[PDB]
From a paper:
We have used superfolder GFP (sfGFP) as a model system to exemplify and understand mechanism of action of these two different nnPTM routes. SfGFP26 is an intrinsically fluorescent protein derived from the original Aequorea victoria GFP. H148 plays an important role in defining the fluorescence properties of GFP through the contribution of the imidazole side chain to the charge transfer network that modulates chromophore protonation state equilibrium, and maintaining local structural integrity. We have demonstrated the versatility of genetically encoded phenyl azide chemistry to positively switch protein function through two different non-native PTM events: photolysis and bioorthogonal modification.
Replacement of H148 with azF results in a ∼90 nm blue shift in the major absorbance peak to the less favourable 400 nm, indicative of the chromophore (Cro) ground state equilibrium being dominated by protonated (neutral) form. The likely explanation for the absence of N2 is that the azide moiety accesses multiple conformations through rotation but we cannot rule out loss of N2 during X-ray bombardment during data collection. The H148azF mutation removes two H-bonds from the Cro hydroxyl group to: (1) the original 148 imidazole and; (2) the OH side chain of T203. Both these H-bonds are key to Cro deprotonation in the ground state, so their removal promotes the neutral phenol form. The structure suggests T203 side chain rotates so that the hydroxyl group is further from Cro (4.8 Å versus 2.7 Å in sfGFP) and poorly orientated to H-bond to Cro. There is also a shift in the position of the loop housing residue 148, bringing it closer to the adjacent β-strand 6 resulting in the expulsion of a water molecule. WB is observed at a similar position in other GFP variants (e.g. EGFP,43,46 the S65T GFP variant and YFP41) but absent in sfGFP148azF, with the nearest water molecule ∼7.5 Å away. The loop housing residue 148 shifts on substitution of His for azF, with one of the main consequences being closure of solvent channel and breaking the water interactions network through to the chromophore; it is narrower in sfGFP148azF with only a single water observed in the channel. Visual inspection and analysis using CAVER52 shows that the channel and water interaction network is similar in terms of pathway, width and residue positioning in original sfGFP, sfGFP148azF+1 and irradiated sfGFP148azF (c and S11†). The equivalent features are absent in dark state sfGFP148azF.
Numbering used by the authors: 2 to 64, 68 to 234
Write the structure that this text describes.
C-alpha cells in the first residue's frame, strides 16, 4: 500500500463515542497514540457526561485495527491500512447473552495527521438490574483471537468472535460480536486470505484522575498464513 506508509511511525489517536443505552445518553473521549510497527497502542478514555452507565470493559472492542502488526509475509492481507487515508466504516452487533444488544457504526480515517475513530452506539433491551446496567462486571480483560475473512461478495472484511466478561459472582457474561468493515473511498483495497488477529488488552486506572475513566494498553499481531515468504 501507500496506506502502509502512514503507519511507519508513532501516530496520534483520537476516539469519540456517542452512546445511548436504554435511553441513557453518554459520551466518551479517548486520546493517545499507536505504533503499528510493534502492534502497540496506548489510550486514556474519559466519560465526558459524568458517570458511565455501563461497565468500561463492555466498550473496549468498540473504542482501530489498522494498528495491528502484520508480519512481512502477510502484508498483502492487511485491509485496514490499505483503506487509508480515506478510511473504512466499521459496524457491529454485540449481543449480550440473556441481556441487551449494542449496535455500533464508526468511521476510522485520518483527519490531518491524527487517526480518528468516531462512533455512534445504540443499546437496546438491557435488563435494568442485569450484569451490564447493574454494574456487575469485573474491571479486567483477556486475550482473544479475532478471525478475519474476506467478504465473499463485496469489497471489505467480516469477523465474528466472542468476548467473555468476568462477573462478580464467579460466572461469565458472553458478548457475541458480528463485525463488517467496508472502505469509505473508491480506490483499490487488499482483500485478505483467512487469518486472525492475536489481541491482548490491559486495563488500569490513573491514580490522579478523578473523572470516570479507563487507561488501556493493547498489543495486536496478525497471524495464520502459511504462504508468501521469499
Amino acid at each position: 500500500s501507500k496506506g502502509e506508509e502512514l503507519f511507519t511511525g508513532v501516530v496520534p489517536i483520537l476516539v469519540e463515542l456517542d452512546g445511548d443505552v436504554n435511553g441513557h445518553k453518554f459520551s466518551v473521549r479517548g486520546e493517545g497514540e499507536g505504533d503499528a510497527t510493534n502492534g502497540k497502542l496506548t489510550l486514556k478514555f474519559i466519560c465526558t457526561t459524568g458517570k458511565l452507565p455501563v461497565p468500561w470493559p463492555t466498550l473496549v472492542t468498540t473504542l482501530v485495527q489498522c494498528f495491528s502488526r502484520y508480519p512481512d509475509h502477510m502484508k498483502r492481507h492487511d485491509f485496514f491500512k490499505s483503506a487509508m487515508p480515506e478510511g473504512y466504516v466499521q459496524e457491529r452487533t454485540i449481543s449480550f447473552k440473556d441481556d441487551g444488544t449494542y449496535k455500533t457504526r464508526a468511521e476510522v480515517k485520518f483527519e490531518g495527521d491524527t487517526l480518528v475513530n468516531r462512533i455512534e452506539l445504540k443499546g437496546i433491551d438491557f435488563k435494568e438490574d442485569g450484569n451490564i446496567l447493574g454494574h456487575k462486571l469485573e474491571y479486567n480483560f483477556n486475550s482473544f483471537n479475532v478471525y478475519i475473512t474476506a467478504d465473499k461478495q463485496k469489497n471489505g472484511i467480516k469477523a465474528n468472535f466472542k468476548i467473555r466478561h468476568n462477573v462478580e459472582d464467579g460466572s461469565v457474561q458472553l458478548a457475541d460480536h458480528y463485525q463488517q468493515n467496508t472502505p469509505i473511498g473508491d480506490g483499490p483495497v487488499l482483500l485478505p486470505d483467512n487469518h486472525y488477529l492475536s489481541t491482548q488488552s490491559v486495563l488500569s486506572k490513573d491514580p490522579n484522575e478523578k473523572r470516570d475513566h479507563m487507561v488501556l494498553l493493547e498489543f495486536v499481531t496478525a497471524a495464520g498464513i502459511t504462504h508468501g515468504m521469499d
